Amino acid sequence: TQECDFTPMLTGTPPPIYNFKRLVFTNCNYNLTKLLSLFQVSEFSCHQVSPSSLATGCYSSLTVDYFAYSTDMSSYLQPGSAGAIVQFNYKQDFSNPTCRVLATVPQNLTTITKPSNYAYLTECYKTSAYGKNYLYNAPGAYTPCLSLASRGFSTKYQSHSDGELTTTGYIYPVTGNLQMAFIISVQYGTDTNSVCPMQ
Amino acid sequence: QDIGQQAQEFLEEFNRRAEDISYESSLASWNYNTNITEENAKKMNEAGARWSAFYDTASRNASKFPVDSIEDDLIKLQIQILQDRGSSVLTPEKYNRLGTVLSTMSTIYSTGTVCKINNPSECLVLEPGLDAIMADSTDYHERLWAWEGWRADVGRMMRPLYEEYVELENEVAKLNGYSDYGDYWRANYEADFPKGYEYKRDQLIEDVEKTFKQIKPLYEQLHAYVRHQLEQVYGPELISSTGCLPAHLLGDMWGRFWTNLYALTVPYPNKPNIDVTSAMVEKEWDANKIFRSAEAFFISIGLDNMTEGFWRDSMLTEPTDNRKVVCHPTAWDLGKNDYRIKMCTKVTMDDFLTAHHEMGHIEYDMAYSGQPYLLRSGANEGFHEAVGEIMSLSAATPQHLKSLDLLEPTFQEDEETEINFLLKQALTIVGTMPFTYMLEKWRWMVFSGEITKQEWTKRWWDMKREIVGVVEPVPHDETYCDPAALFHVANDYSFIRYYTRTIYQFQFQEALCKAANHTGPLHKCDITNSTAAGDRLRKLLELGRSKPWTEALENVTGEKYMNAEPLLHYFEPLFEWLKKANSGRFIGWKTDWAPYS
C-alpha cells in the first residue's frame, strides 16, 4: 500500500545494546534487499524461517530492533551462551520467526554518524543485607535498570545507584568502521496480512 | 529497636557504600603491579589508605550491637567479622612500636648476606645467590658453610626482635577476647552454626595430630629410602643407617620441600618423565591458546565461561613496552564484575599447569559473587587453594594430554613412569607435611607459654628429631633464632593453611573421581567431559562463607571432618613399591646420633 521507509535506521547515531530502538512496521510494501545492499552483512543466522523466503512473504507484523554492536562479540548473542549480554542487556525472543544480521557499516554511508564508545551492562541488581538480588532480562523486553543507565557512562565499571536498584556499565572505544546488529522478527497473520513485499 | 533490625539497617548501608571504595583500592593496585612506576606507587597508597579508614570506622560502628541478641544467621556472621578489630586495639604508641618491630624484622630478613672466609669482600644474598648452592651442589662443606652462615647471620639479629613481637602480639590477641596469639590464628576454623556442624578452636590441635598419625607410616618409608640414596652419595661416615638426616642435605635452605633430591633418589633413571614443551613449541602454541584450552576444560565439566573483558583487560604475557611488571602469577577479583589474571606466560608444561590453577581461582571467584561483601572467600583459608590444585591434578594426566595431540597417540603409559611420577609428587607433598606441622606446633607452644623463653632453641631441635627426623650439623645455643630464618615466621604469616589444604585436595578428588564413574587408581583420574562432577563442585563454589566449612565439606565428600585416607589412597602404588625396596632396612630413626657428637 505505502512505503515503510528505513530512514530512522539510516540517520543519527545507533544506540547501545541495552537502549535498543524498535521499528515495528505495519501495512506497507517492503524490500529488504534494498536494506541489506547498503551494508556489509557478516551473518544471517535465522530461526524458524529462511533468508531466501523471508523477503517476499505476507505477514501481519514486522519488528526490527537495532543497536550498535561490535562483530567480535558475535558469540554472546547466540542462544545458550549465558554471558553478561543475554542476562542484562538483551535476550532474543525465539517463540516467533526471527533472524539476526550483523553489519559492517561502510564509510560511503554518510548519514549515519559514529559514537565514541561501544557499551553494555555488566550487572543490574538490588542490594540488601543478604547480598545481591539479580534482575535478569525477560525475552524481548528492556532491562529493568533502563532509567538508571540513561545518565551516561564515562569509564569502565562505573556504577549508578538510585535507592534500590544498582546498575554498572562498561565501555571500550570504537576502532575502524561502525558495526550494528538487526534483530528482524515477523508474525504470521490469521485474518488480514498487510505486511506484503514491494514487487 | 529490635537490635537485629538495626544490624540489618547497618549492614545494608555498609553493603551499599563498601563497593565503590573497595574497587578503587583494587584498581589502584592493578595499575601498580603491571605498570610499576612512582605515580602509580603514590596512587596505590593514597587509594588504599581511604579503605582502611572506612573499614575501621565500620568496625567501630559494628562494635555496638551485642551478638548475643541477633537471632539470625547471616546477620550474626557479619557483625562478628566486623567486630574482629585486629592490631588497632592497642595504645597509640605501642602500635607504632609494633610497626617498628614488624618492619625491622622484615628488612633484616630481606637484606641478608653471607660473606665467605676465603675472600671477605665476596658476599651472597639469599635470592638468587644461596638458593643455587643449596639446591644444586653435592658438596658437604659448601652446604654446611651456606647453612651455618645464613643461620648465624640472620638468627642472632632476629632473636632479640622476635621476643618483643611475642609480647606485643600476646596483648593484641588478649584485648580481643582470645587467650593468646595462637587462638587468634586458630579461630579461622571456628563454627557455632546451625546444628551438628559446630567446631571449636581447640579441636584443630587434636584433629591435626590425629591426621598426622595416618601419614606417618608413609613418611617413615620415604625417610628410609631418601636416607639410603643419600648414603650412596655422601658416604657412610657422614650419614648413618639408623639416625636422622643432617639438616643441610635436603635440597633447601630450610628443608621444606625435598624436590631437589629427585636427581639423587630417582627410582628408574632411564625412563624420562612426560614433557610436551617440545611438542608445544613444534605445534605453534602461543600464550593465548593455553588460556583458551584451559577454558574448554571448565566449560566441559560444567562451570562458566570467562567474561568478555577478561580477554582484553588481563595481562597474559609480559609486555614489550617500557612497563616493568612483576612476573608472578596471581588471579584478581577486582570488585564490580571484572576478573583479571596477571601472568607472564611462556610456552612450557609449567605455564600450562598454571593457567588451570589461576583459572580455578577465578572460577571460584565468579561463583560466590552474590554473597554480600564479607562472605566472599573460601569457607576457611585452605579451601581456595585446594580447588585450584584439583584442576592441575587432572590437567596433567596422560589422557587429557593425549586428547589435545600434545602426545603421540600410540602411548603405552610405561609402568615404571608412574612410580617415577608418584615419587616426584611425594617428595613435594609428603615431604612438607612433618615440617608444616612441627613449625606450627612450635609456634603455638611458644605463643601460649608452654615453651618458656630460655628453651626455644632447645625445644626446636628436640621436636625436629621426633617429628621431622632431621638432626642439626652444628651445636646451637640460646642466642640463635633458627625458626625466624624462614619467610613466614619473620613476616608474620600463618602456616597451618599449607597443612590443611594438602588434606582437602584429596578429599575433593576422591569425591569428584567417585561422581565421574572412575574405576582404577586415583592418580590417573580425569574430571573431563563429566557434568556430574561439576554439578556437585558448584554446590561448594556457590556458598562463600555463608555456610561453615564442615557443612560445605559434607555437601561434597559425605564426611564433615578432615581425613588422610584419600592421601594414602593416592599414594597407594608407591607405598607398596617402597615396602619392597626398603627390604631389610630400619624403618624409622633413633634420636641420639649426631654429626658433631
Ligand SMILES: *[C@@H]1O[C@H](CO)[C@@H](O[C@@H]2O[C@H](CO)[C@@H](O)[C@H](O)[C@H]2NC(C)=O)[C@H](O)[C@H]1NC(C)=O
Ligand atoms: C529492492 O531493492 C533493490 C536494491 O538494489 C532494487 O535493485 C535491484 O536489486 C537486485 C538484487 O539482485 C538486482 O538484481 C537488480 O538489478 C536491482 N535493480 C535496480 C534497478 O537497481 C530492487 O529493484 C528493489 N525491488 C523493487 C521491486 O523495486
Ligand SMILES: *[C@@H]1O[C@H](CO)[C@@H](O[C@@H]2O[C@H](CO)[C@@H](O)[C@H](O)[C@H]2NC(C)=O)[C@H](O)[C@H]1NC(C)=O
Ligand atoms: C562458552 O563459549 C563457547 C564458545 O566457543 C560456547 O560454545 C558455543 O555454543 C553455541 C550454543 O549453541 C554453539 O552454537 C556454538 O557453536 C559454540 N561455539 C563453538 C565454537 O562451538 C558455549 O556455549 C559457551 N558456554 C556458556 C555457558 O556460555
Ligand SMILES: *[C@@H]1O[C@H](CO)[C@@H](O[C@@H]2O[C@H](CO)[C@@H](O)[C@H](O)[C@H]2NC(C)=O)[C@H](O)[C@H]1NC(C)=O
Ligand atoms: C604507567 O604509569 C605512568 C604513570 O607515571 C603512565 O604515565 C601517564 O599516563 C597517563 C594515563 O593517561 C597519562 O595521562 C600521562 O600523561 C602519563 N604521564 C607520563 C609522565 O607518562 C603510563 O602511561 C602508564 N603506562 C601504561 C602502559 O599504562
Ligand SMILES: *[C@@H]1O[C@H](CO)[C@@H](O[C@@H]2O[C@H](CO)[C@@H](O)[C@H](O)[C@H]2NC(C)=O)[C@H](O)[C@H]1NC(C)=O
Ligand atoms: C558509622 O555510624 C555513624 C553514626 O554514628 C555514621 O555517621 C553518619 O553518617 C551519615 C551518612 O549518610 C550522615 O548523614 C550522618 O550525619 C552521620 N552521623 C554522625 C553522628 O556522624 C557513619 O556514616 C557510619 N559509618 C559507617 C562506615 O557505617
Ligand SMILES: *[C@@H]1O[C@H](CO)[C@@H](O[C@@H]2O[C@H](CO)[C@@H](O)[C@H](O)[C@H]2NC(C)=O)[C@H](O)[C@H]1NC(C)=O
Ligand atoms: C571430551 O569430549 C570430546 C567430545 O566428545 C572428545 O573429543 C573428541 O575425541 C574423539 C576421539 O576419537 C575425536 O575423534 C573427536 O574429533 C574429538 N572431538 C572434538 C570436538 O575434539 C574428547 O576426546 C573428550 N576428552 C576426554 C579426555 O575424553
Ligand SMILES: *[C@@H]1O[C@H](CO)[C@@H](O)[C@H](O)[C@H]1NC(C)=O
Ligand atoms: C564509495 O563509492 C565510490 C564509487 O563507488 C568509490 O570510488 C569509493 O572508493 C567508495 N568509498 C570507499 C570508502 O570505499
